[PDB]
Amino acid sequence: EKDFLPLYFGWFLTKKSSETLRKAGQVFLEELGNHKAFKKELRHFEKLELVSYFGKRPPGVLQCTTKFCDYGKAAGAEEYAQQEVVKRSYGKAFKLSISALFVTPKTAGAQVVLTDQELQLWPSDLDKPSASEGLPPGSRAHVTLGCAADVQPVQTGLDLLDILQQVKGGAVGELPRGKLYSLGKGRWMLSLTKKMEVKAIFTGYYG
Ligand SMILES: [Cl-]
């Protein structure tokens, strides 16, 4: 009998960090929903409460996934899990840097900017999203804050990749914690003046 892998590996925020980032996310959603520029462009996306719009919020603690394994059914799962760095890092505490919050018609999330140490724990898979073309490794790294009723949480990273592609290719408001950008097609990013730092434990989730 072989051993099951986790459902996924990743960085699981401490309860305090999780609560801090959730609160920040919610404040962002309330501020964006109330912003003139958002309300004006509501056609591409009475007023909309975005906390309600993103009705599926993650359970438990917030987390940033490295490798989704599906207990070993996902491509590259065993290959990822067998790495020394993964084993050595299992249970270890990290600090994650969050540089921006974003919204799309599908998801709400936080952009994680990995250290190169943390990048050692990022997977190197054969199948990459076409939206990840020409972006630095680990660009997909995110914390999902919410999504629409008919959307899967994994969409949040795809949405992030798409936003970063737009930013790579080359400002409608000033919020207290950063500058607000309208990227078109219902996409919005808050670029934080100060990166947000959260504490997290790298480990595996089985459910
Ligand atoms: Cl929480």
Residue numbers in the entry: 161 to 205, 213 to 337, 342 to 378
Paste lines from the article.
CNPase consists of an N-terminal polynucleotide kinase-like domain10, a catalytic phosphodiesterase domain11, and a membrane-anchored C-terminal tail, which contains a cysteine residue that undergoes isoprenylation. The catalytic domain enables the rapid hydrolysis of nucleoside 2′,3′-cyclic phosphates to nucleoside 2′-phosphates. The CNPase catalytic site, lying in a groove between two lobes, has pseudo two-fold symmetry and contains two apposing His-X-Thr-X (X denotes a hydrophobic residue) motifs, characteristic for 2H phosphoesterases 113537.
In mouse CNPase, this is done by His230, Thr232, His309, and Thr311, in a manner, where a nucleophilic water molecule activated by His309 can attack the cyclic phosphate and a pentavalent transition state is formed. Mutation of active-site histidine residues (H230Q, H230S, H309Q, H309S, and H230Q/H309Q double mutant) abolishes CNPase activity.
